Design a protein around this ligand. Structure first.
Ligand SMILES: [Zn+2]
Ligand SMILES: [Zn+2]
Length: 189
């Protein structure tokens, strides 16, 4: 198997999941890496936000971020949906998804247009503008993604391409929303 930014599935200056070969161009990394998270990284579904903070594991009282910087989508809850957009990101069905809309200047609150991983991701990321407040808000969108994903595709499978991704979606979304301790032998293709 090649490095390939699992997302893109293209080789390069990718970063292989020291745990599940999940390589990433970094930038394609859901929240986009910082610059190669070391050859010991582990996806975002496997590693998520850089915990390198070392300390402040539960002691900081309150500063820039510890347990609730906004609690919108919340640091970690945002991280979960990010465990998703990513989950999505990584697979193929999402590839179409990443880019479905005609965005231009309407997705932030567009009339339920088409969204896409990146759409949602930016939200999640705050890259966008209007960030959600729930990985279900998110999921709702990606779930939308999926909706129009399934209606726009028309070239791929139809549903089950969407769905298989829609399941994947909910899988990591399920992982993140628990402990991703379910099955570590299933995260390794
Ligand atoms: Zn890539
Ligand atoms: Zn991984």
């Amino acid at each position: 198997s090649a490095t390939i930014c699992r997302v893109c599935q293209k080789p390069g200056d990718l970063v292989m999941c020291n745990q599940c070969e999940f390589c990433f161009h970094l930038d394609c990394h859901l929240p986009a890496l910082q610059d190669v998270p070391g050859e010991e990284w582990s996806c975002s579904l496997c590693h998520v936000l850089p915990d390198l903070k070392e300390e402040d594991g539960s002691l900081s009282l309150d500063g820039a971020d510890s347990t609730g910087v906004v609690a919108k989508l919340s640091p970690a809850n945002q991280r979960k949906c990010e465990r998703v957009l990513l989950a999505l990101f990584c697979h193929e069905p999402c590839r179409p998804l990443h880019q479905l809309a005609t965005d231009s200047t309407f997705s932030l609150d567009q009339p339920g247009g088409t969204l896409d991983l990146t759409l949602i991701r930016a939200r999640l990321q705050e890259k966008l503008s209007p960030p959600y407040s729930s990985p279900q808000e998110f999921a709702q969108d990606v779930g939308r993604m999926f909706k129009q994903f399934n209606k726009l595709t028309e070239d791929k499978a139809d549903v089950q391409s969407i769905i298989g991704l829609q399941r994947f979606f909910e899988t990591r979304m399920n992982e993140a929303f628990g402990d991703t301790k379910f099955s570590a032998v299933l995260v390794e293709p």
